[PDB]
Amino acid sequence: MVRVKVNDRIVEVPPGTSVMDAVFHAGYDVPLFCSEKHLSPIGACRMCLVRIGLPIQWQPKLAASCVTAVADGMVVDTLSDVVREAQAGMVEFTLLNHPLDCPTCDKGGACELQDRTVEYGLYEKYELPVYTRFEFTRRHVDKHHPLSPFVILDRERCIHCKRCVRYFEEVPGDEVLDFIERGVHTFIGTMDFGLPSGFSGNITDICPVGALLDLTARFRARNWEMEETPTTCALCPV
Amino acid sequence: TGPILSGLDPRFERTLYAHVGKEGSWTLDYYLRHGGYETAKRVLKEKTPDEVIEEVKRSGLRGRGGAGFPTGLKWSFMPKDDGKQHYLICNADESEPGSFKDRYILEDVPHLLIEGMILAGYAIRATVGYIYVRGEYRRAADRLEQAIKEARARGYLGKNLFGTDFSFDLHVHRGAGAYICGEETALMNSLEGLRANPRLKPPFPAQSGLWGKPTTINNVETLASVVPIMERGADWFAQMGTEQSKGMKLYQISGPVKRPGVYELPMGTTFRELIYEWAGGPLEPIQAIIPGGSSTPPLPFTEEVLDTPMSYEHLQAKGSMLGTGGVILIPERVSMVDAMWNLTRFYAHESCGKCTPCREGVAGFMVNLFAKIGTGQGEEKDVENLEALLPLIEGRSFCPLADAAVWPVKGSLRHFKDQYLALAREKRPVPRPSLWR
Amino acid sequence: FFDDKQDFLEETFAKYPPEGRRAAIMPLLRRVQQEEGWIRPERIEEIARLVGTTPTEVMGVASFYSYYQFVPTGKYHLQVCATLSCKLAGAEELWDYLTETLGIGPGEVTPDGLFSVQKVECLGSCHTAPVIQVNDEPYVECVTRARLEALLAGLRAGKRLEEIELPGKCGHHVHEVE
Amino acid sequence: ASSERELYEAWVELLSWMREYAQAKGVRFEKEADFPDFIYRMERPYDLPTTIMTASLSDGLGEPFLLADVSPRHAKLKRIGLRLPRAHIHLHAHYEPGKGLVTGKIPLTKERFFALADRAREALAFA
Ligand SMILES: Cc1cc2nc3c(=O)[nH]c(=O)nc-3n(C[C@H](O)[C@H](O)[C@H](O)COP(=O)(O)O)c2cc1C
Ligand code: SF4
Ligand code: SF4
Ligand code: SF4
Ligand code: FES
Ligand code: FES
Ligand SMILES: [Ca+2]
Ligand SMILES: [Mn+2]
Ligand SMILES: [Mn+2]
Ligand SMILES: [Mn+2]
């Protein structure tokens, strides 16, 4: 195994490990939008940035911890003003064109974007705090549109991770969802209208916000209000 | 004279743009009559692949795509002998504003490019080669496909070249209008029939590029230059330019200057030389100049600038950098705020959309600041945010495009910050002078 | 659409590997365009089946580029270079005149059905600004206010562009101004 | 200026043409979103003419071929926008005094709007 030292804590960890896993493995944390258990990692949201030292010889630019491998005797700082200032900034770039639906949005208290904003954003520079810098016309597009009788799509809320389109290609293998235009103009869309595959409900639990939601259960209760009963699905042998 | 080549010297030789503009320059006949695939034949029977790489390592050829990287050391990364198929890609997607040097090698001396790629593939054991040109370059596209055909006819392409057990074929692939497709790794995706986002590089193109395969990508200018180099020695090549910028370079210049265009000069020659001797000097008062591409930071119109040797170093340690050798002069009659109001709404357009900081960052916030302030709705707070924004972006996006955008804005605040303050504090719109005839 | 011309298909699949078929998406898309003027969603379904992927995957790929039009376009789709270098030559002015004369925005087409407009990025002939690329053929460089109006009436009277006469002179890789 | 009020006045009418063309050519008109500066305006005053900030003309599948929006009362550089989703074409209508609704220099009349919506409908609408 390889020796890594996160902040003030050192850990054993196999060679191939993502610095992101090594970070969490020491019991630390970092904003994390586009990466998902069991999917191909790519630094796309640019949230999981750390500072990396490797001889102490701080590398000049910040690394995407989720697609950076770990080297023997490496240091990882996740608390520096340099880190935290960058994070709060990246949280701001995200919320920039987002819609303002939280009360009405069914993605309630179970929304990664919400949790990560209140965790790592609005940075303390060292009276009256400034909540929003962007004062222009936010992005306006197609809203509350069902893709299938089981899945309803809010494009305005999408944060362009790749969680969904990635998954369709990788796990079941049914490329029925992709982005469209480009720039600030790009969006999720389909041409295979039904939402073909029989594994299309999974994108529902991954989507980090309330773009892709379970229509079978639209507008029933807020996520905390639900009592949750863990069990097994007996509809077949698996 | 006595030592080194850095100007309107009398011992300098035009090699690339030699026959550009010459009537009928692109017939396989023209190319042959002026000693066509003479070099390529030589090299293939005589120098081995490894030997044709050292002659480029020694030439000191650095990449003309704007990258600047050591293109002899670049070929040095390719898998020696594994048995896999290897790929060579000419990057004739030339889309970075103010830059147009590739275009005319494509339209008027394509066989030079072809020969240059035969050499290139030979060095790296790539039997197959591709040319991704911009789907806007119409004549260029037609002259390449033309030439690729004449070459294939007369045995200069394909089967078994010159009797030697090497075979090499070219394929053209036109684009569809996307600057980002210029990025070496986004180009591969684009070509491969995917949406052209740049790839994750920790796995490198030399070890997995086009279709999983060991590929090497180079600029048109880089490749066209592999010929004279192999024709008349690295020593000939090195005998031009600075101590880190060897050889000659395709410099082009645009803006309100007397006679804009492409001028083949050696590495080192000064801006003052290009702007004046050749281009015929300005027609308006100038306030700044953009050295390499549009992606390079603007420098003030000063003597100490005019006398700087346009190089991968004198420019480097001068704030900016030498991109594509595409200079653009900007007249005082136009506001530097506007200049970039423009350039950044150019980048805003061209962003692939993969990164939060570029998609949302520059394409969202940045272009919108310029807007406000450039209409005279601007406040002093507006110039401060814009400034504080750049470092939240530049450091860390998925690819260079993001930097390409901030750099010119950084370097514009750092020399004209008063010009931004000016518009803001007096709620004044950028000046709208008559510019076209 | 491609049933008609399968000589074009053998040929263009042949430039790419067996396992490299999507590669064809670009050249196919490209054809439809230079033939029909724009790409209809039926073309995208076809091409998907031809190249061997989903309609979804091709849809995204085609909506990524600037050249592919997805709504009808007049006979002569005028693409105007807007980028800086052409700006300093008069681009914005030329756009204001052109658009104001014809009375069309980007998404529309003139009533007489032969004039679409689009702003584009650096065409890579900055030394001859302002620059204009018609459909998919050689730029019309150095569009002075006068050079322009002639281009306009040339096409307006059905002269094939490759042989309209343009006042004044325009150089190659170097250009002399007066 | 007071233009802001006349621009919003013009937002109502563009919406009016949308609802007309919609019933007329029998194609779904869909209210896409309300102004959060109404929903979340509390005891605070509200004098705007409508509460609808994003409208659209969708087809049978519900995928829109025309999208329309104006910027909220509290945002800067107010413009009204028209976008053909999927065809990459964006418009930006301002408001000039005496002239009226303009896309820069060309007036945005009912007629011209209908032209765009038609072009869009025929070209874009999936079903
Ligand atoms: C965002 C971005 C856009 C680029 N666009 C182009 C381009 O349009 N043309 C080009 O030749 N290189 C472009 N490049 C640089 C390419 O990576 C370069 O062409 C490639 O390195 C060719 O290799 P060479 O420099 O060794 O010749 C771009 C790079 C980046 C980061
Ligand atoms: S996706 Fe999250 S941030 Fe956006 S409206 Fe819903 S709960 Fe709020
Ligand atoms: S719809 Fe959700 S999962 Fe898909 S890219 Fe958008 S934010 Fe990510
Ligand atoms: S920096 Fe911009 S162009 Fe490059 S990968 Fe990110 S969003 Fe795409
Ligand atoms: S989590 Fe690493 S970049 Fe998104
Ligand atoms: S700026 Fe118009 S061609 Fe380069
Ligand atoms: Ca809908
Ligand atoms: Mn709905
Ligand atoms: Mn464009
Ligand atoms: Mn209010």
Short mmCIF file of C-alpha atoms in Angstrom, two decimals, chain A residues 41-46 49 61-62 67 85-86 89-90 92-94 96-97 133-136 139 159-160 162 178-184 186, chain B residues 177-178 180 195 197 200 202 348-357 359-361 363-365 368-369 372 385 388-389 392-393 395-398:
data_model
loop_
_atom_site.label_atom_id
_atom_site.label_comp_id
_atom_site.label_asym_id
_atom_site.label_seq_id
_atom_site.Cartn_x
_atom_site.Cartn_y
_atom_site.Cartn_z
CA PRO A 41 -14.90 9.70 -12.81
CA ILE A 42 -14.20 12.90 -14.71
CA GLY A 43 -13.36 16.31 -13.35
CA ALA A 44 -16.22 18.24 -14.89
CA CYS A 45 -17.96 20.12 -12.11
CA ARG A 46 -14.56 21.17 -10.74
CA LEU A 49 -10.28 20.63 -5.91
CA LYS A 61 -2.45 24.62 -9.71
CA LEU A 62 -5.30 22.99 -7.79
CA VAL A 67 -9.53 12.04 -11.13
CA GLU A 85 -11.91 30.46 -1.40
CA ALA A 86 -11.86 28.38 -4.58
CA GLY A 89 -16.35 30.38 -5.82
CA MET A 90 -17.18 27.13 -7.55
CA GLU A 92 -21.22 30.38 -6.84
CA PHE A 93 -20.63 29.49 -10.50
CA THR A 94 -23.10 26.61 -10.04
CA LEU A 96 -25.41 31.30 -10.98
CA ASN A 97 -28.04 30.25 -13.58
CA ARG A 133 -23.04 38.67 -6.82
CA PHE A 134 -24.64 37.78 -10.16
CA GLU A 135 -27.36 40.34 -10.90
CA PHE A 136 -28.40 39.52 -14.48
CA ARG A 139 -31.02 31.02 -17.64
CA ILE A 159 -26.15 21.53 -13.22
CA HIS A 160 -24.49 19.77 -16.15
CA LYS A 162 -22.72 14.02 -16.38
CA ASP A 178 -27.35 13.43 -23.93
CA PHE A 179 -26.60 17.17 -23.94
CA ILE A 180 -27.66 19.32 -26.88
CA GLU A 181 -26.35 22.76 -27.74
CA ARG A 182 -23.10 24.12 -26.20
CA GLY A 183 -21.73 26.94 -24.08
CA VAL A 184 -24.11 28.23 -21.44
CA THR A 186 -26.39 23.26 -23.54
CA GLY B 177 -17.69 25.15 -36.80
CA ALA B 178 -16.22 24.83 -33.31
CA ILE B 180 -12.79 23.94 -29.28
CA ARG B 195 -19.44 15.51 -29.10
CA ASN B 197 -15.31 17.80 -25.38
CA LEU B 200 -9.03 13.35 -19.32
CA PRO B 202 -3.83 11.47 -17.05
CA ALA B 348 -18.32 32.64 -24.44
CA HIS B 349 -19.61 31.29 -27.74
CA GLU B 350 -16.98 28.63 -28.15
CA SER B 351 -16.99 27.00 -24.70
CA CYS B 352 -17.80 23.30 -24.87
CA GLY B 353 -20.00 23.49 -21.71
CA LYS B 354 -18.32 20.66 -19.70
CA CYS B 355 -16.90 22.86 -16.81
CA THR B 356 -18.80 24.93 -14.30
CA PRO B 357 -16.11 27.70 -14.29
CA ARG B 359 -19.65 27.33 -18.98
CA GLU B 360 -21.06 29.20 -16.01
CA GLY B 361 -17.87 31.13 -15.23
CA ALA B 363 -19.88 32.19 -20.59
CA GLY B 364 -22.23 33.29 -17.80
CA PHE B 365 -20.72 35.94 -15.46
CA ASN B 368 -22.14 39.85 -18.77
CA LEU B 369 -19.86 42.25 -16.88
CA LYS B 372 -23.01 46.19 -18.26
CA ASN B 385 -15.79 41.67 -9.36
CA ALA B 388 -11.74 39.06 -8.58
CA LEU B 389 -13.39 36.54 -10.92
CA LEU B 392 -11.42 31.59 -9.56
CA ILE B 393 -11.42 30.47 -13.18
CA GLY B 395 -6.32 28.20 -12.04
CA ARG B 396 -8.67 25.33 -12.64
CA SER B 397 -10.91 24.35 -15.51
CA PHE B 398 -10.87 21.09 -17.37
#
